[PDB]
Design an enzyme around this catalytic site. Structure first.
Site, PDB file in Angstrom:
ATOM      1  N   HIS A   1       0.440 -14.730   8.899  1.00 30.95           N
ATOM      2  CA  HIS A   1       0.240 -16.172   8.887  1.00 30.95           C
ATOM      3  C   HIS A   1       1.051 -16.914   9.940  1.00 30.95           C
ATOM      4  O   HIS A   1       0.852 -18.122  10.096  1.00 30.95           O
ATOM      5  CB  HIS A   1       0.586 -16.736   7.499  1.00 30.95           C
TER       6      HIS A   1
ATOM      7  N   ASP B   1       0.840  -1.192   0.000  1.00 32.67           N
ATOM      8  CA  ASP B   1       0.000   0.000   0.000  1.00 32.67           C
ATOM      9  C   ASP B   1       0.879   1.247   0.000  1.00 32.67           C
ATOM     10  O   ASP B   1       1.935   1.273   0.635  1.00 32.67           O
ATOM     11  CB  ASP B   1      -0.932   0.057   1.218  1.00 32.67           C
TER      12      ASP B   1
ATOM     13  N   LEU C   1      -1.678  -5.735   4.126  1.00 33.90           N
ATOM     14  CA  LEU C   1      -1.761  -4.541   4.950  1.00 33.90           C
ATOM     15  C   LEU C   1      -2.672  -3.533   4.274  1.00 33.90           C
ATOM     16  O   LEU C   1      -2.771  -3.494   3.044  1.00 33.90           O
ATOM     17  CB  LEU C   1      -0.373  -3.942   5.230  1.00 33.90           C
ATOM     18  N   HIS C   2      -3.322  -2.703   5.091  1.00 29.89           N
ATOM     19  CA  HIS C   2      -4.223  -1.689   4.561  1.00 29.89           C
ATOM     20  C   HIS C   2      -4.375  -0.565   5.576  1.00 29.89           C
ATOM     21  O   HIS C   2      -4.577  -0.827   6.768  1.00 29.89           O
ATOM     22  CB  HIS C   2      -5.592  -2.295   4.228  1.00 29.89           C
TER      23      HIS C   2
END
Length: 321
Positions: free
Chosen positions: A286, A231, A272-273
């Site tokens: 994970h 991002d 991701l954000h």
């Protein structure tokens, strides 16, 4: 060699099998996907809403088509309606309403080919959706991932409703992001090739028109796995989860080598954000099948799903007066 920062991470939720696809919808509600949920040894992946005040997890959608369960793996919200575009490694690209109903956007692409399973996607500000497809053909074809053979592909779902395959021959194409210039226009498409240490770039010349494929950046580390999700922040720094590590890499707008690394209290970040209108980045991983958050140094880039709101609409494009 590279500066490392160590911000405070806060755990958001856990026990989400294969946790990925962190995303916020037009209202600021938060969702993730659980691609590895199974029933009787068969895919039964889930799309979940996570209440950030209570931590409560709600299954929004358990997609299946003709009895084939999905493997939802990445997401982007729509600005036009409060629906999510969900990249599904088994079912392709889905449109999922917050009430749980869903539609499979494509069994076939613009050439009449069977669709490939998808994992990540990214809107440009003109409304085209750029999509990575690391799996082979969607259900009912047998499930295959481009881990060892170069058959992962890239698509663009245009504003005219065309599913156009724009490239191929990738080994697990993963994260994808659009670099927008200060005038608001799409300039570069960045694509992670996760089974290598490479980030690729294309010059966007129009809807489903990319050219000038080049190596854009390199991911450090010698462990298994490279860049997953990615991002841009508001300065067009690209933050890139390094799944083969416990870091998020920070690239400058022109790529190359990372200029800084973010140390995480976990291995294998998958996605991701940013949360809209904040500096807060939500990260799936994970090692623990978990979701975390941390505060970055500045705001994220204005998000597609905010671009029709008062205070945002009209502020993306800029021109000579």
């Amino acid at each position: 060699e590279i500066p490392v920062i160590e911000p405070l991470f806060t755990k958001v939720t856990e026990d989400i099998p294969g946790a990925a696809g962190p995303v916020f919808d037009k209202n600021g509600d938060f969702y993730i996907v659980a691609p590895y949920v199974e029933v009787n040894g068969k895919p039964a992946g889930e799309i979940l809403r996570i209440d950030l005040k209570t931590g409560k997890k709600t299954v929004i959608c358990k997609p299946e088509v003709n009895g084939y369960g999905g493997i939802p793996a990445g997401c982007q919200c729509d600005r036009d309606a409060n629906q999510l575009f969900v990249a599904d490694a088994r079912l392709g690209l889905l449109v999922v309403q917050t009430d749980g109903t869903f539609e499979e956007i494509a069994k076939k692409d613009s050439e009449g080919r069977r669709m490939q399973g998808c994992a990540y996607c990214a809107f440009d500000y003109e409304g085209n959706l750029w999509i990575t497809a690391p799996a082979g053909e969607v259900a009912p074809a047998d499930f295959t991932i481009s881990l060892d053979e170069k058959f992962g592909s890239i698509y663009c779902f245009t504003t005219d409703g065309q599913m156009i395959q724009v490239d191929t021959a990738f080994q697990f194409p993963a994260g994808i992001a659009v670099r927008h210039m200060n005038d608001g226009r799409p300039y570069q498409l960045i694509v992670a090739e996760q089974r290598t240490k490479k980030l690729w770039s294309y010059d966007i010349k129009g809807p489903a028109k990319i050219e000038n494929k080049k190596v854009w950046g390199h991911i450090p580390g010698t462990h298994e796995g490279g860049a997953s999700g990615m991002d841009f922040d508001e300065d067009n720094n690209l933050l890139v989860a390094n799944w083969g590590s416990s870091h998020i890499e920070v690239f400058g707008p022109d790529g190359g080598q990372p200029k800084m690394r973010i140390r995480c209290p976990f291995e294998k970040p998958s996605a991701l954000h940013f949360k809209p209108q904040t500096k807060t980045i939500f990260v799936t991983e994970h090692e623990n099948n978990a979701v975390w958050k941390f505060e970055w140094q500045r705001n994220g880039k204005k998000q597609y799903c905010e671009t029709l709101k008062f205070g945002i609409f009209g502020s993306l494009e800029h021109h000579h007066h």
